[PDB]
């Protein structure tokens with residue numbers, strides 16, 4: 001029932017994601033010189049360094065907010081992909097499955113702790 005435990009849990013999950021080779025295209029903001037039309041398709045860029053920095057700045061109130069930004073990394077990859085078989089998009093699908101498998105207990109524990117706090 002620790003209402004604050006999600007933060008270290010998210011730091012550790014981001015550390016695992018940075019170790020994953022599948023995260024390399026998503027570790028820093030997309031390079032507009034490499035993809036000059038990126039902002040014509042993607043309204044809200046997002047990347048894992050921005051997520052980590054937002055967390056470390058104390059600018060996430062809950063793991064749901066972090067999870068919304070990580071899911072935006074994956075939906076941006078899906079929106080920008082020219083093909084469902086592209087290399088970078090395939091890396092995002094595997095990384096998304098890994099992320100969803102690990103974030104589920106973080107979200108459940110947080111929501112349970114908050115419900116206990118408000119009982």
Ligand SMILES: CC(C)c1ncc(Cl)c(C(N)=O)n1
Pocket residue numbers: 025026030031035076077078080081082086087088089090
């Ligand atoms: C990470 C950004 C640059 C991105 N998102 C999705 C795809 Cl699938 C691609 C690509 N180059 O094929 N690039």
